[PDB]
Amino acid sequence: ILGGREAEAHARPYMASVQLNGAHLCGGVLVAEQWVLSAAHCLEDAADGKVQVLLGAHSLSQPEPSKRLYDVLRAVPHPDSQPDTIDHDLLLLQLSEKATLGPAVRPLPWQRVDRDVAPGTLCDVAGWGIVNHAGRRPDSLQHVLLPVLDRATCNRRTHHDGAITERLMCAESNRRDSCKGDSGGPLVCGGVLEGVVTSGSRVCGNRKKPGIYTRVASYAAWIDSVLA
């Protein structure tokens, strides 16, 4: 998270850390008692690495009574996601057992009404990804308020030259942005999950290249079909 600040510990009980071989790999959001939503590209190069989800965390390293590491029983990436694109970049992770809900572990409602967020809206994005232009990561969770940016602008050749579909959305990336390691994390407007970070292989903090986020409402049918 660029241009952000440290979050209030355990104020986002849906915040998940998708972990690979015990290291933070990607952001996530607990969308059901036994399911975690994240980005599909996180796992693209993961190979045989042990996939686990960290719930109830603020510090990746320090003891907290809420922190719990769950093994993943089954990883479901959106069937139409491929490494060559940013389309359908969603991944569902089934926990070994249902999570122990509490004031620091709670699932988050996701937007089901397929309507764009009004441009200029300040949405909250959190994560453990890069905090500075030097590519270094924080131990405890960061967050930043970003204004939504209209698709037409985001699609200008200066910016993402037509990559933003009706199924995706942008936020302004000037000085404040989502970086590598924030992918799969949540974009929140009106305390309802609106999007999922898909930063991938984009350099952050440059206003010329807005932040991209997958629209959860565009994949409502899919999410339920997996969660059934």
Add this chain to the structure above:
Amino acid sequence: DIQMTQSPSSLSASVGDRVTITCKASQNVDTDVAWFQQKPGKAPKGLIYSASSRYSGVPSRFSGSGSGTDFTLTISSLQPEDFATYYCQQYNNYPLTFGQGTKVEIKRTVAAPSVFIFPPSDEQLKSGTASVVCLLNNFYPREAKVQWKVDNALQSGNSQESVTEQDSKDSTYSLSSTLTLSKADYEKHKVYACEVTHQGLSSPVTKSFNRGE
């Protein structure tokens, strides 16, 4: 605003040649540069975007380079379908700006023009206007100096010329220089001549006609 100074304006090349078209932005425009191809009477066709990326369906022989101020369009092996006008475009800053264009022409051997002087029709002289045409047929290169001299005197303004596109078969040019004067101004003189100055000519060929003959 940001100026795009395209160079050269015109370029003469053979089929199979490597060809370079340069563009100079008056300020850094990062890689927000595009290249278009335009054939006569047709809409521009997108070739390159992001200074180096090719649009889908654009042949591998087309390539773009540059970052900042100096940009280049390269045609590795020039094909017949590539003789057109190319334009660079800046999309970094408002207003979006274009280059003056580069016309790519087929290079051939020097061919001197076959000069013809035409007297004005009596049907036209029935009315107050008289038009004198000095035709230059099948020539190369384009650079031709058609100077009008009526009774050993230099004409200016009263003349208007037209040039055909490069010939699909023999790849030559033709020119129609029309000198217009009133029937009153026409009867005042007898000698009407044009002095063609072409590279393929040793000495400037003068084609004269007389009012009466």
Add this chain to the structure above:
Amino acid sequence: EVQLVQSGAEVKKPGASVKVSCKASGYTFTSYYMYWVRQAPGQGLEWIGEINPTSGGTNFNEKFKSRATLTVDTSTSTAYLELSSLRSEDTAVYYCAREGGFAYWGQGTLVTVSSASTKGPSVFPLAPSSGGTAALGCLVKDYFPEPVTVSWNSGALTSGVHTFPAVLQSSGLYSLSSVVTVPSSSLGTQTYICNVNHKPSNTKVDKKVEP
């Protein structure tokens, strides 16, 4: 398939306003900006401006901000260009083009701003002088608007035919010339008549060339 279908050619008097339409199909119209370019006869390209379909927001080139208007009908996915208080300098080919993704452009709308009226041409001969090879033609003077179609011996003679591009006179009326080269032996033996047709004025003239 994606296509930008622009409106028909226009001929306008030098005081009026023109409204060029451009209907987009094959993609989400609202997902991209639409920009407009102008190309005067035998000239380069000029960026006019752009429109955000979602907001209706525009970005203009200062040159045009004054008389140009850019609108969008989202219900019909059509971008409009309104150029008002027209002058002869406004005579140009106007193109709408998508801003983002594959470089899609419309076929182009030709606007012709002239105080001139629909008129057929007058055909005059460029008579052969008479060596080894000689030239003969037709002077296709004073016509409006563009174009004029020229052929020889009713399509029988295509080799040596150099139909020059139209040129606009001080009168504000286009004047051509269609030359043809033939050997000096065929003069008097074979007859040469140039077919000149001006579709707008519904004029068809066939003039014979004699020395």
